[PDB]
């Protein structure tokens, strides 16, 4: 799910950037260190809103490092997954263990046990697929997945998906 979250960061600036345009460098650091990053506490951070209106407090010089620590408050759109949520995505990889669905910046794993009994794994077909008398699942196919669990690390997030329940599967 996508949220507009008010986040704060502690940036460090090397002494080589102490000039009239120091604020510009801090904005670049925020755009290069925040955007595209994954944080378990808040989830993926996609975009930073109000680029011009970023508030920067006075920097503090570290004793033995010489760099300045800047606390930057900004508004950014984030994607934090949750178990029990229903999301849509496209299958990107397949194997005996299970196929993976691309939900935004996250990859959902559908284990062989979680998928219905009817689905069977066949690798003779190129590419490999999960086939059921009704439908067939393969790369680039759109699948509706239910997140059954999420493990959020400080710098990474992984989740598992299930299509056992009704109204979940090929779209």
């Amino acid at each position: 799910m996508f949220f507009i979250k008010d986040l704060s960061l502690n940036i460090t600036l090397h002494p080589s950037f102490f000039g009239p345009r120091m604020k510009q460098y801090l904005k670049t650091k925020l755009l290069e260190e925040v955007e595209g990053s994954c944080t378990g506490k808040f989830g993926y951070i996609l975009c930073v809103l109000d680029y011009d209106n970023i508030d920067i407090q006075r920097g503090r010089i570290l004793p033995t490092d010489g760099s300045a620590e800047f606390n930057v408050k900004y508004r950014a759109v984030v994607f934090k997954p949750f178990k029990g949520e229903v999301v849509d995505g496209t299958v990107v990889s397949c194997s005996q263990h299970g196929f993976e669905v691309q939900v935004g910046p996250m990859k959902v794993f559908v284990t062989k046990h979680l998928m219905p009994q009817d689905l069977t794994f066949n690798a003779g077909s190129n590419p490999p697929s999960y086939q059921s008398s009704e439908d067939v699942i393969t790369i680039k196919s759109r699948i509706r997945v239910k997140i059954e669990g999420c493990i959020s690390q400080v710098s990474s997030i992984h989740a598992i998906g299930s299509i056992k329940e009704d109204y979940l599967g090929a779209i």
């Binding site: 090397h14 002494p15 080589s16 102490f18 000039g19 006075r58 010089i61 004793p63 010489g66």
Partner: peptide, 28 residues
């Protein structure tokens, strides 16, 4: 600490023009 702070900053390839304020109340 300002004298050592700027000395380290200069040694780390910092431009030379001491834009620092002592946070005792902040004073420049």
């Amino acid at each position: 600490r300002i004298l050592g702070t700027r000395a380290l900053q200069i040694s780390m390839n910092a431009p030379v023009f001491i834009p620092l304020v002592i946070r005792r109340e902040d004073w420049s």
